[PDB]
Design a protein around this ligand. Sequence first.
Ligand SMILES: O=C(O)[C@H]1O[C@H](O[C@@H]2[C@H](O)[C@@H](O)[C@@H](O[C@@H]3[C@H](O)[C@H](O)[C@@H](O)O[C@@H]3C(=O)O)O[C@@H]2C(=O)O)[C@H](O)[C@@H](O)[C@H]1O
Ligand SMILES: [Ca+2]
Ligand SMILES: [Ca+2]
Ligand SMILES: [Ca+2]
Ligand SMILES: [Ca+2]
Length: 198
Amino acid sequence: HHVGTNTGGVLVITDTIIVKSGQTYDGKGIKIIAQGMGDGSQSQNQKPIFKLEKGANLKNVIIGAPGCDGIHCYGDNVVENVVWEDVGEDALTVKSEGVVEVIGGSAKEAADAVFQLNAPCTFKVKNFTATNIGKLVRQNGNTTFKVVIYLEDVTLNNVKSCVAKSDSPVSELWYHNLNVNNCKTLFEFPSQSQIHQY
Ligand SMILES: O=C(O)[C@H]1O[C@H](O[C@@H]2[C@H](O)[C@@H](O)[C@@H](O[C@@H]3[C@H](O)[C@H](O)[C@@H](O)O[C@@H]3C(=O)O)O[C@@H]2C(=O)O)[C@H](O)[C@@H](O)[C@H]1O
Ligand SMILES: [Ca+2]
Ligand SMILES: [Ca+2]
Ligand SMILES: [Ca+2]
Ligand SMILES: [Ca+2]
């Protein structure tokens, strides 16, 4: 394990970091604290820490409290080895269509959702831990577009509401090596047959 060369540094930011199409922001283990961008509460008006335009990637950053509005993904994004020490309003939001993969890393202390899906997408969570959360994945309430969610090698502890929630009959969730402790209910979808193993 080579921890990154920015390990031990803290970057204090005052505006959202924009990562452009085709670019990869590699924090090399930096911890980010955001100023003036939100308090990590359930207020709906906070700014994202990162905006990942379509085709942008992000890796190897710790996001400290306050989590603000987390990471906004505009599709075709890889988010790798990102640690949310204290999720804000939500951890990551899919804002526009495409494939979005969260690989490695962890999240803790999400009062509500970790991952928020606001557009049709393929959303994969791989090699990920989360503790003390409301929901791991929420498709935006009362929407009926299609998402396909994959949970692969995911460990969850202390899930207050459910692992995943959708109000869309056409959406699907597929899981493989999902371990869950102390969770109220696993899946809140119109029908349980929308959930599959692989
Ligand atoms: O992207 C966002 O931050 C969205 O936040 C709000 O929507 C979420 C969610 O999609 C809604 O269904 C609703 O969720 C319920 C409740 O308000 C709360 O989230 C919790 O008790 O869970 C409920 C549920 O999941 O059914 O509100 C959510 C919220 O974060 O408050 C916005 O209303 C959206 O327009 C997005 O901005
Ligand atoms: Ca919200
Ligand atoms: Ca949000
Ligand atoms: Ca929190
Ligand atoms: Ca919320």
